[PDB]
């Protein structure tokens, strides 16, 4: 590098975006708004003479169904139109098979990054541990690492010959490798591993701060987080804000020398940090979470409220709506009409079938029971995504409630077998994806036991046999849950989660909440 010439950098950053390509209904986010924005950031860097890198932490599947019926194409192509450099391999990239995130890596003009996943079978990684970038006469390594939790809270299927090794180590291994062989003047990584409060990450995998405090001091200029979806602004030394409110300073966490943020989600905030480089000094020198379209609530003592802007209106990018519009209205119809109704609110909020019974939860495992003849069902709360409102329900709305496209299956076991497994299962947590929904089951759980046991108000009866539904998820081993796939009775029944659900309301509407109501039956002490 040229000698006491400081260099200006400007990085970009979002992850987390969850199919959200299209602006919501009020007019929030979306990637038209982005682009506009980010064209702006470019033009003033580009003015004020230095460099610009736009990263994205992961996750761009899953989470809006316009989007995840068409396996986010609209999003990876957005994201060229919005010019991304690169992007860490996310948790939700593996929620489809691995044809598709191939076909996403096609589509994407940018790479798909990884260092730590690796084929079993051949002990090679799966995608490029990183990507170097020329800046001004700069040499920039990008390194992708993705939470070697995605085994553990995905798919079992897809993960028979893929591995997550450590992410931490990997990163030793791989800013080693990199000092050596190639010596870029300035390293970054881009991760979906999550940003927890000095490193307390509790049941989670190891994240951000566990690694820069592993990592040599310094050995990354910043660490361009995502997964725990959180804007990273800090309220105090190793604490984040509760409740950050758009528009205001955001002080990214700092650990052993590395930088650590994160904005959020779903292209709610594009982050902004710019950085001086000088003599291999990387100073950073100013952050931002830059707000896109968020609004909040103001009230007329009219009794009127409406939404307000934070920060002045970023217009959407025609180029942008153009090329979204078509992805955006595919089958719009369809997924708008009415399969029925509901006289009351389905609970499906993540701060209650994580923590609670709820009546979503009857209602979607009272729909497998129904298809698969069952007797009980249980699934894992962290499967339920949205609640559906009091009035009309549209297949959109099912698909907001079970984006993963899991597929309904059954398995004729033995009572003994029905006391373990829910025993089992009843050990799961609250605050946890793995909180259990039971249907058809009762109990009172203390010390690691189930007293009370009931199906259908009867008492199980260890040598009668027992048949229960739940999707090949959990059937699998995901979430922790005991494997019932490589038992006798076992069954795909190669149903559609959604497909279940949507025939199941269509045939019981109009619903009576009242019959899916958790009155307690299952307990714990
Ligand atoms: N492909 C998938 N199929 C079924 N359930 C899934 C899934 N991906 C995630 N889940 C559910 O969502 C939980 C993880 O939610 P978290 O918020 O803790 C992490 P993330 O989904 O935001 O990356 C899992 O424990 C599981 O219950
Ligand atoms: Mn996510
Ligand atoms: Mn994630």
Known sequence: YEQDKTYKITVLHTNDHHGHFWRNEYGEYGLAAQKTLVDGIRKEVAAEGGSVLLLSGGDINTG????????????????????????????????????????QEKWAKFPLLSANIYQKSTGERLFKPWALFKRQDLKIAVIGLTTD?????????????????KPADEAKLVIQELQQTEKPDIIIAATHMGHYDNGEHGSNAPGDVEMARALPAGSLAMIVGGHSQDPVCMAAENKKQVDYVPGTPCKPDQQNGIWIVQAHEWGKYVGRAD?????????????????????????????????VLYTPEIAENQQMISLLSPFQNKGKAQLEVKIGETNGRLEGDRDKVRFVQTNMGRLILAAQMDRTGADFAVMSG???????????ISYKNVLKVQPFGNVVVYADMTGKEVID??????????????????????????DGKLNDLKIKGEPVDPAKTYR??????????????????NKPGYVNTGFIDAEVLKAYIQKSSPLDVSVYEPKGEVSWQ
């Open 149 to 165: 939790d995605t085994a553990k809270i995905g798919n079992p299927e897809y993960f028979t010959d893929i591995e997550f090794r």
């Open 275 to 307: 950085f001086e480089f000088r003599n291999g000094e990387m100073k950073m020198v100013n952050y931002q979470l830059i707000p896109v379209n968020l609004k909040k609530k103001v009230t007329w003592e009219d009794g009127k409220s409406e939404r």
């Open 421 to 446: 497994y829910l025993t089992a299962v009843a050990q799961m947590k609250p605050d946890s994806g793995a909180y259990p929904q039971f249907a058809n089951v009762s109990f009172v759980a203390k």
């Open 64 to 103: 809006v169904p316009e989007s995840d019926l068409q396996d986010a194409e609209p999003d990876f192509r957005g994201m060229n139109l919005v010019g991304y450099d690169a992007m860490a391999i996310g948790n939700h990239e593996f929620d489809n098979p691995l044809t598709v995130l191939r076909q």
């Open 382 to 392: 962290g499967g339920i995504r949205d609640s559906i409102e009091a009035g009309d």
């Open 468 to 485: 229960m539904a739940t999707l090949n998820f959990n059937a699998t081993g995901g979430d922790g849950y005991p494997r019932l796939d």
